[PDB]
Amino acid sequence: MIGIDIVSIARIEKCVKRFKMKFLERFLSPSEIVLCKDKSSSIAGFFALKEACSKALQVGIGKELSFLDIKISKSPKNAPLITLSKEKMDYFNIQSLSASISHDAGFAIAVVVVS
Amino acid sequence: MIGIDIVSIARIEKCVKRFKMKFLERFLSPSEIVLCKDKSSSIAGFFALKEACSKALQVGIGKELSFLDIKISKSPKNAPLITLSKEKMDYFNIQSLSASISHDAGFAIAVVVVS
Amino acid sequence: MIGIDIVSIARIEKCVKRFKMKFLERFLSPSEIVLCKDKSSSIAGFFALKEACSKALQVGIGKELSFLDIKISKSPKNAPLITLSKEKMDYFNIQSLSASISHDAGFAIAVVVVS
């Protein structure tokens, strides 16, 4: 199955002025915060990727899937990797998740394919 | 196979002032019109999803595939579902269609994966 | 696996004024140059598709995959087709590549699914 998401980077930027940490720490774990390096476009991107993951599993971000249930990490070549909780991985019955991100000109977008 | 489409919401809005119904009823069935609730961003989205479906099957919207051959519906959790005519489903030899939509900041985009 | 890319058409346009040919001929082969017909939006699109292909294979455009290792061609119905070098196709161990492009309102985007 597939999920996709497009986010205004500027809209993320203005939500990063909502008690700063209060926003970020809702959807990014500390290690994911390290990955984005304070960069609004990278933050927009992880946000878009988590949304896209929730759409790909057809639940959205609710009480079946939290932002923090979705772990994003990077390959040695900076490729985005995505994993769910080992439990959630079984509850949704997932073999593999494939992800990608891009940004240009005020927009971030992400897409996820789930098996 | 995969198809994708990005549409200006504003461009859809200005085509929704082209005898209103004359535009909408070309690509949306009544039930799909109920789903979009007059919202230009949802209409842009279904349009983008139908285009994306036609690209995923590699024919585009012509005389092998009409807009109205593509039925969009929603899951109970508001996930976009896509089906073709039971005939067209065989003519194109499709096992399953997987879809997703998103919009932000003046743009709608959609993607479809066909098996 | 999946890759996606979004490119500002305008940014491509302004790089098409960087000794014109010096830019284009780095990522487009002559036949691919014929396909885009001088159109900045089509050039943006092939660029986005090549980026998306490199992300889908998880290497990016470096010294494991050049822009010119990725050949884009068109079906009789104008569907984008993508092939790698017969060697690279084995080195990355690829069964099939599926691609799609779209542009509207200053943006091109592309997505690739690799088997």
Swiss-Prot record, chains A, B, C:
Compartments in which it is found: Cytoplasm
Gene Ontology CC terms: cytoplasm
Binding site for Mg(2+): D5, E51
Primary localization: cytoplasm
EC number: 2.7.8.7
Recorded GO MF terms: holo-[acyl-carrier-protein] synthase activity; magnesium ion binding
Catalytic reactions of this protein: apo-[ACP] + CoA = holo-[ACP] + adenosine 3',5'-bisphosphate + H(+)
An annotated GO BP: fatty acid biosynthetic process
Co-factor requirement: Mg(2+)
Pfam families referenced in this protein's UniProt entry, alphabetically: ACPS (PF01648)
Domain of life: Bacteria
Keywords: Cytoplasm, Fatty acid biosynthesis, Fatty acid metabolism, Lipid biosynthesis, Lipid metabolism, Magnesium, Metal-binding, Transferase
Stored InterPro entries: 4-PPantetheinyl_Trfase_dom, 4-PPantetheinyl_Trfase_dom_sf, ACPS, Ppantetheine-prot_Trfase_dom
EC main group: transferase
Family as reported in the entry's similarity comment: Belongs to the P-Pant transferase superfamily. AcpS family.
NCBIfam families: acpS, pantethn_trn
Function summary: Transfers the 4'-phosphopantetheine moiety from coenzyme A to a Ser of acyl-carrier-protein.
Protein name: Holo-[acyl-carrier-protein] synthase
Protein species of origin: Helicobacter pylori (strain ATCC 700392 / 26695)
